[PDB]
Design a protein around this ligand. Structure first.
Ligand SMILES: O=P(O)(O)OC[C@H]1O[C@](O)(CO)[C@@H](O)[C@@H]1O
Ligand SMILES: O=P(O)(O)OC[C@H]1O[C@](O)(CO)[C@@H](O)[C@@H]1O
Ligand SMILES: O=P(O)(O)OC[C@H]1O[C@](O)(CO)[C@@H](O)[C@@H]1O
Ligand SMILES: O=P(O)(O)OC[C@H]1O[C@](O)(CO)[C@@H](O)[C@@H]1O
Ligand SMILES: O=P(O)(O)OC[C@H]1O[C@](O)(CO)[C@@H](O)[C@@H]1O
Ligand SMILES: O=P(O)(O)OC[C@H]1O[C@](O)(CO)[C@@H](O)[C@@H]1O
Lengths: 314, 313, 313, 314
C-alpha cells in the first residue's frame, strides 16, 4: 500500500488543460473548490456532534474569489450575482448550489454541492448578464456527494470522471474514467406523492413502468429526495430521474442555473439526455439567475420513451 | 476539548451497573463498535484501489473475542455459529453485517443491523436459542454508514443515538430517549411492485396521493436501503413498508436480523411494527433465515393501514 | 481489512481473565485510551486557531468514570483527588497528563506517563495509598504523541507497545514482550549542566567521548522530553540520565508519576533504573510530588555508571 | 468552528505570486509537493501498524514531474540528476531530501522532507549543471516536519511562513506569518559524542556555553539527531545548531544541495546566519550534486560569537 503514483483531481485537470494550452485558471478554480468540498464534507460528518447552508455559502465564495479565476458568482442563497474585486478577477462565471437540501442532514440523507462554470465571453464589465448563458455553453459542471464516501463527479468537454476523497491524505483520487450511462435502465425516480398534479404524459409513463404493456418486468422505483443522490444513482446504475412541474410548482422546483444545468451537462457528457419535456434543458436561454425548470434526465432510451409520450399529448 | 464526553462505552457501562450484572453486554457492544468503525472506514474508501464477506468475518471475530456471546446468526451463514467453550458468554446475537452491500456502487447509505437475546436454557448452545420472539430481545439497533456514521441503540430503557466522532474514534451520545412522531407525512414503499400489491396496501397508497378528507398528500421517499429508510422514519416520522409482493409472498426482509431489530427500535420509540396481520415482535420463528412482511413507523399512520387491512375482511 | 486485530482492550481483557479478577483494570485502561486519543488529536492541531489543563481535566474525568479508581495523583494538583464513593474502584493512578507541555511550541514529541497501584488498606482512600514503592505498581507506561501515537504498557507479564491506528481509533498491538539491548551506544543527558555535575557522571560522560579501551565513542542524543528520550532508550538501547545538578539537588523529575513508571517499564524490559545510590523503584515516597535523580537504560551501561559512583567512595 | 476563510498554503503562494505576475508554475509545484507531504505524513503515522525512503522518493519525483513546473530533479537517493520529459517540463530545478533520517522512524524520532527550488537560468538543454547553483540563487526552500503535528515551513524572497496540516480537511493552514529567529538564544545543539574530533574553535565555543566566562547561566543542550527537528527548534526557540566537520567526516556530513542550503536559506530569511565556519553556506558554488558541507546556523549573535572564535584560530 502507499501508492507512489496518485492521480488526484488537480493532476488530472492539469494533464488535460496543459494539452489544451490553458492559462492555469481552471486548475486553480477547481483546486479551490475541492478545499471547500473537503471542509463541508468534514462538517457534515460531525454535524450531530457539533445555518450550515449559510456557512457553506460563505466558504465557497471565499475560496472562489481567492482562486483569481472568477469574476461573477451566482448562489441559491444570494439574491443577486456576486461580482469579484478587480485584483482577484479571472475569467470564469461559477453558478453553485452550496449545500443542496440541507434539511436532509437531520435524517442523514446524502446531500451535495452542485456547480456550473462558464467562461465570461463579453468584453464589458462583469455583471449578472455574464451568468445568463444557456447550459450549452458550460465549460465544466459537476457535483460533490457527501455520502458514505465523498465523491466529486466532474464533467468537462471530454467526458465525465469520478474522483473519491481519500480521507487520509485529503485528496480526490480518480476512481472512474470517462463514465457513460446505460442506454436503457430499470429504475424510475420521481416523488409520487404529487400523483394528483402530474400531467398526462408523466402519468401515462409511470403506469408503463409499473404495468409494462410489453409484459416485461416493471421498473423498480427509487427516490432519495436529494437530487445529487438521485442523479448519482441514475448516472452509475441507469434509469430516469424526473422532477417535472406539477400544478403547485408550475415551472418545476429545481433551478436552472445551479441545479438543472450542471446535472444536464453531466448527463449529456455521459451519453444521457436531459429535457423539460418540451426542450433540451441546455438550450434554454435563462432570463433570471434564479429561474426554475422541469427536468427529466437519464438513460437515452428511457428519456426518449417519455419524450414520445409528451409528443403524443400536445 | 469537551472534557466529559459520554461515549457508548460509558453509557452502556452505567446502565449495566444498575442491572447488577456481569459486564458482558458492555464487553459485547464495545467489540461491536470496533467492528463498526472498521466497516465505516472501509465503506468511506470503497472505490479507491467481497466487503460483505470481510464485514461478516470482522463482526464474528470481534464478537467471539468479547467473551460475551454463545450463538451467532448471520445473513451470510447457512447455520448458526456456536462459540467455542473457552470464549462463551451469555448472549445470542443475530446481525446483518452490511445490509444491501450492492448499494455501495451508487453511494447509497447502508448499515449493520443487530439483535441480542439472552440464552436462557441450560443445554448446550444451538440455533434454538436464537429462535425466540423479537419481543424477548434485550438490545437491538443499527449502525448507518452515511454522510456521518450513527449507531442507534435500543435496550429496556429507550432508544439513544451515538455519532462516531472520526477524530477520536468514539461514538458520542448525541440524542437521548428518541420517540417517534405520532403521525408523519411521508410514506416509503417500492411502488414499482404496484401490480403485485394486495388490496389494503393499494388502497392506502391511493389515499396518500389522493387524500379523501381533502388533506395535504404525503411525500414519498424510498432510498432502497432498509437502514436509511427506517432511520428517516424514526427521526422524521412516517411509514415504511415492505409487504408481500407475489415474488416475495412471505416478504423480502429477514425476520431475525432485519425485521425484529428495527421493530424493537420502533416500539421502544413509541412506533408500531406489523406484518399487516400480527405484531412483528410476537412472531415465533421456526427458521433462522425466515422472512416476514414489515410495516413500521408513526403510530397513527400504521393504525390507519391496519384499519384498511381489517376493513378488507 | 485484517479481521482479527489485537487491540489494547482485547489484550488487557484476556490477561485480566487469567487473574480471575473483576474487570476493573480493563475498564480503567479503556477509559485512559479515550483520553489519550483526544489528547493526541489536540496536539496534532495545536497551532491551528492551557492544553496541560484540559489534558488534566480529561484524564481525571475518564478515570473517575471508569468505576475503577479511588485516589488520583496528578502533576497539576497540589493534593491527591479522592474519587466519590459511588464511582470508586480499587486502583490508585498517578499520572503526568502532558509531560513537558512547553515543548509543543517546537514540535518536540511529549507524552502522558502513568503508574497504577492497587489500594490495599481498608480505611478510607487517601494520599497514603499512593505512597507505595514503585516496586509495587501493578501496571505503568506512557503514550508518546510523536510522528505516530504509541502506548507502551508494562504489567506483571512484560512490556507491549500499541500503536494508535488513526483510521479506526484503536490501539493495535505492534510489538510484544519488548526487551532492551544489554549494552547500547547512545548516552542521553543535558550537558549544558556540566559544571553542576558530580564526579561520577562527569567521569562517565568523559569516557563516552574519549573511550579508554580505544573503543568507538557513544553517540549523544537528548530530545529534552522524557517520553521521547526514554522511548529511544527502550527501542534502541543506551543510557538516559537526569542526575542531580545543584539547581535541582534531588533531581528534577518527579518520582511517583515520571521516574517510577519509566523505571517499572525499564526493569520489565530487562533494563535497570537507579538514582546512582538506590534502585528508583525501591524508594519509599514521603510526598506525592517528591523528586528523585534517575539513570535508566541498558544493563551494562547503567552498571558501568554504578561502578564509577562506587569507585568514588 | 468551521472557519469560512481558511488561508491554505496554495492561497498564500497565489496571493503573493499574483502580486508578482508569475506563470502559476510555483503554485503547481508546491501544491504537488504538499500532496506528497500528506501522503508521507500518513504513512509515517501508521508505519509500525503497517524502503519508505525509496517509496517516498518515487512519490516525490512523480508528483513533481506531473506539476509541469520542473525540469531537473536532484535526490539523495538517485546518483544523477533526473531530467524531466519535454511534455512535462517547466522551469524549476528542485533538489530534495525525501525522508531525512528514515532510521529514526523505529524510535519515533520526528523526521522531515527538505527541499530547495531554483529557477533554470540557462538557455541550454536541462542537465545536472542547472542544479549546480550556489544557495544564494534559491527561489524557495523549506521542509516538512513529521512530528506530533505536520508542519510545512516555506521560505521565499519575502520571509518564512509556517503552515500546519489540518488533518480533517487535508490542507496546510497558515499558522505563523513572517517568522524571525531570536537574535541570541539559549540552547546549543551538537552531537557531543564526537568531542574528540572537533576542531579548536568548536571546542572552545562549547566550553563557553557550559562554563560561561561571563558567569551568566550556561546554555541548555538539545540534540534530537534529526536535522529538521533540530533546525525547527532553532528557528522557533533560537539558539545554534552545529554540524561541523570532525576528522572522520572531513567535509561535514550534511549535503550542500538538499539539506544545508534549504536550511541556510530559511535561517537567513528569518534573520539568522548559516556558515561552514569559513564561508556563508549560500555562497558556496557546488561542483558535485551530492557535495557535503559543514553548517553552523541559528541566531545571529550566537553564530557570530562562534565565527569570531573561528577567526581567532586560523
Ligand atoms: O420533496 P421534493 O419536492 O420531492 O423535493 C426533492 C428535491 O428537493 C431538494 O431537496 C432541494 O431542491 C432536491 O435535492 C430534491 O431533488
Ligand atoms: O452486565 P450484564 O450481565 O451483561 O447485564 C446487562 C444488562 O443490562 C442492560 O444493559 C439494561 O439494564 C441490558 O441490556 C442487559 O441484559
Ligand atoms: O429493491 P427492493 O426490492 O425495493 O429492496 C430494497 C430492500 O432490500 C435491501 O436492499 C436488502 O434487504 C434493503 O436494504 C431494502 O430495504
Ligand atoms: O480485573 P482486575 O480485578 O482489575 O485484575 C486485573 C489484574 O490482572 C492484570 O492485568 C495481570 O494479571 C494486573 O495488571 C491486574 O492487577
Ligand atoms: O531542560 P531540561 O532541564 O534538560 O529538562 C528536560 C526534562 O524536563 C521535562 O521537559 C519535564 O519534566 C522532561 O520531559 C525532560 O526529560
Ligand atoms: O548521528 P549524527 O552523526 O549526529 O547524525 C545526525 C544527522 O544525521 C541525520 O539523521 C541524517 O543526515 C540528520 O537528520 C542529522 O542532523
Amino acid at each position: 500500500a502507499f501508492d507512489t503514483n496518485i492521480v488526484t483531481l488537480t493532476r488530472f485537470v492539469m494533464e488535460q488543460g496543459r494539452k489544451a494550452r490553458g492559462t492555469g485558471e481552471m486548475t486553480q478554480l477547481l483546486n479551490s473548490l475541492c478545499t471547500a468540498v473537503k471542509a463541508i464534507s468534514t462538517a457534515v460528518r460531525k454535524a450531530g456532534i457539533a445555518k450550515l447552508d449559510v456557512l457553506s455559502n460563505d466558504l465557497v465564495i471565499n475560496v472562489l474569489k481567492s482562486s483569481f479565476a472568477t469574476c461573477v458568482l451566482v448562489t441559491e442563497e444570494d439574491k443577486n450575482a456576486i461580482i469579484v474585486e478587480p485584483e482577484k478577477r479571472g475569467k470564469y462565471v461559477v453558478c453553485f448550489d452550496p449545500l443542496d437540501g440541507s434539511s436532509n442532514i437531520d435524517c442523514l440523507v446524502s446531500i451535495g454541492t452542485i456547480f456550473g462554470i462558464y467562461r465570461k465571453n463579453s468584453t464589458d464589465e462583469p455583471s449578472e448578464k455574464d451568468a445568463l448563458q444557456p447550459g450549452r455553453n458550460l465549460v465544466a459542471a459537476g457535483y460533490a456527494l457527501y455520502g458514505s464516501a465523498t465523491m466529486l463527479v466532474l464533467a468537462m468537454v471530454n467526458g465525465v470522471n469520478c474522483f473519491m476523497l481519500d480521507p487520509a491524505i485529503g485528496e480526490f483520487i480518480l476512481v472512474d474514467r470517462n463514465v457513460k450511462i446505460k442506454k436503457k435502465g430499470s429504475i424510475y425516480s420521481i416523488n409520487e406523492g404529487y400523483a394528483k398534479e402530474f400531467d398526462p404524459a408523466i402519468t401515462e409513463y409511470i403506469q408503463r413502468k409499473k404495468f409494462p404493456p410489453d409484459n416485461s418486468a416493471p421498473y423498480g422505483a427509487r427516490y432519495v429526495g436529494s437530487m445529487v443522490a438521485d442523479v448519482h444513482r441514475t448516472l452509475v446504475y441507469g434509469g430516469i430521474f424526473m422532477y417535472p412541474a406539477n400544478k403547485k410548482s408550475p415551472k418545476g422546483k429545481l433551478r436552472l442555473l445551479y441545479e438543472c444545468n450542471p446535472m444536464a451537462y453531466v448527463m449529456e457528457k455521459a451519453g444521457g439526455l436531459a429535457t423539460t419535456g418540451k426542450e433540451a434543458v441546455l438550450d434554454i436561454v435563462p432570463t433570471d439567475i434564479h429561474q426554475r425548470a422541469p427536468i427529466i434526465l437519464g438513460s437515452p432510451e428511457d428519456v426518449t420513451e417519455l419524450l414520445e409520450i409528451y409528443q403524443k399529448h400536445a
